[PDB]
């Protein structure tokens, strides 16, 4: 099944909003599949925002995500990626739909709560950057029967 990678920022962990986040990720019926809190080392921050490298906001970047630990997560569940953009919301949390993560939570662009891979192809890259096969699990949910075909 497809599978995204996601990510609470040190914004959220500082505002203790991990439990908030989760469920509004389980609920929606994504699976969690992997997740660990960690701190983020100097080298993964950059080569993860490494397409960013250039940028006026990248220093800032850089700081802010290597400032507290984040919870780092693999979620699974039929068209992962977009769903997990979709209650995620714009990149701008004054422009994210109330009801979505940013939108309900972030305040400001560069303090927005959550990434999320923004497309199948960075969904791979980044769950293999930031996970091991083994740290990943695969399992059947008794909601399964419910939440497809």
């Known amino acids: 099944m497809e599978r995204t990678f996601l990510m609470i920022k040190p914004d959220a962990v500082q505002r203790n909003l991990i439990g908030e986040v989760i469920s509004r990720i389980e609920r929606k019926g994504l699976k969690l599949v992997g997740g660990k809190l960690m701190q983020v080392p100097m080298e993964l921050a950059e080569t993860h925002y490494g397409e960013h490298q250039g ?3 990248y220093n800032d970047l850089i700081s802010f995500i290597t400032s507290a630990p984040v919870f780092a997560m693999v979620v699974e569940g039929e068209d992962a990626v ?4 979709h209650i995620i919301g714009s990149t701008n949390p004054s422009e994210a739909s109330p009801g979505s993560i940013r939108g309900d939570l972030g305040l400001t662009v560069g303090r927005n709560i959550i990434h999320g891979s923004d497309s199948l192809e960075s969904a791979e890259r980044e769950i293999n950057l930031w996970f091991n096969e083994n740290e990943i699990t695969s399992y059947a ?8 075909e």
């Open 141 to 148: 949910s008794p909601r399964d029967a419910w939440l497809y």
């Open 55 to 57: 940028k006026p906001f």
């Open 82 to 85: 977009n769903v997990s953009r």
